[PDB]
Design a protein around this motif. Structure first.
Motif, mmCIF file in Angstrom:
data_model
loop_
_atom_site.group_PDB
_atom_site.id
_atom_site.type_symbol
_atom_site.label_atom_id
_atom_site.label_comp_id
_atom_site.label_asym_id
_atom_site.label_seq_id
_atom_site.Cartn_x
_atom_site.Cartn_y
_atom_site.Cartn_z
ATOM 1 N N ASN A 165 7.338 13.678 4.269
ATOM 2 C CA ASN A 165 6.872 12.271 4.124
ATOM 3 C C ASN A 165 8.069 11.470 4.424
ATOM 4 O OD1 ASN A 165 6.103 9.905 3.161
ATOM 5 N ND2 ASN A 165 5.105 10.644 1.408
ATOM 6 N N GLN A 209 1.469 6.544 -0.277
ATOM 7 C CA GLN A 209 0.525 7.603 0.748
ATOM 8 C C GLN A 209 1.301 8.846 1.171
ATOM 9 O OE1 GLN A 209 -2.377 5.130 3.308
ATOM 10 N NE2 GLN A 209 -2.110 3.648 1.774
ATOM 11 N N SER A 239 0.977 -1.152 -0.061
ATOM 12 C CA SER A 239 0.137 -0.098 -0.002
ATOM 13 C C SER A 239 1.004 1.230 -0.001
ATOM 14 C CB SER A 239 -1.004 0.154 1.134
ATOM 15 O OG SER A 239 -1.843 -1.044 1.297
ATOM 16 N N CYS A 249 7.521 4.231 -5.265
ATOM 17 C CA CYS A 249 6.721 5.307 -4.368
ATOM 18 C C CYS A 249 7.830 5.923 -3.235
ATOM 19 C CB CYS A 249 5.453 4.368 -3.747
ATOM 20 S SG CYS A 249 4.409 3.878 -4.740
ATOM 21 N N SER A 295 2.889 13.987 -1.632
ATOM 22 C CA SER A 295 3.409 13.359 -3.048
ATOM 23 C C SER A 295 3.881 14.300 -3.849
ATOM 24 C CB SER A 295 2.655 12.145 -3.524
ATOM 25 O OG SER A 295 1.349 12.662 -3.726
#
Ligand SMILES: [K+]
Ligand code: NA
Ligand code: NA
Length: 68
Positions: free
Chosen positions: A28, A4, A1, A48, A7
């Motif tokens: 982040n 998140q 996942s 990611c 971004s």
């Protein structure tokens, strides 16, 4: 996942690369910012956990840093 959190960092254009790296990695905690000179090329894949920080020859951020 993955992916998140914050971004993209459009306000970091015009900042120094070092300042940008620290803001990105603080905002982040799931990314690492990579300073790369504009025009030097980087793998055309998707991650990611990566934020490319594209800089001028003077080290100024010249594109909006984004996860990928
Ligand atoms: K700015
Ligand atoms: Na921003
Ligand atoms: Na990126």
């Amino acid at each position: 996942s993955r992916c998140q959190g914050k971004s993209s960092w459009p306000q970091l254009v015009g900042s120094t690369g070092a300042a940008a790296k620290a803001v990105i990695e603080r905002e982040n905690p799931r990314v690492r910012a990579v300073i790369i000179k504009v025009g030097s090329g980087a793998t055309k894949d998707f991650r990611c956990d990566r934020v490319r920080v594209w800089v001028t020859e003077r080290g100024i951020v010249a594109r909006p840093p984004t996860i990928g």
